[PDB]
């Protein structure tokens, strides 16, 4: 149903773009572009069309695009940990 | 249309 996916900060770039966000008909967002070469493409795990429910155990719910984007990136650059955790799901959960 | 972002042109 849902899949906690662990990407290393393996590159100098996250390389992912999302759509959607609160307010929209894609309330949580879903990923539309997982781009060679960075962190995410490097993992293993996650593909376009994943829906981002979690970054770092922080619901999305919310969160309009703008807000969501802001928190993913700052997930990515900080200096508190090598790591940011996805909670993701390929269809919906409950 | 969906708003989109790429995350790694977030200023």
Known sequence: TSTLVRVR???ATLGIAIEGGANTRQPL????TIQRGGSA???????VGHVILEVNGQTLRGK???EAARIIAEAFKTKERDYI???VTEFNVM | ???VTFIDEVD
């Open chain 1, 41 to 47: 493409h490097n993992c293993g795990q996650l593909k």
């Open chain 2, 1 to 3: 249309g969906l708003p």
């Open chain 1, 85 to 87: 955790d996805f909670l």
């Open chain 1, 9 to 11: 900060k393996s590159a």
């Open chain 1, 64 to 66: 309009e695009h703008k």
């Open chain 1, 29 to 32: 967002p879903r990923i539309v």
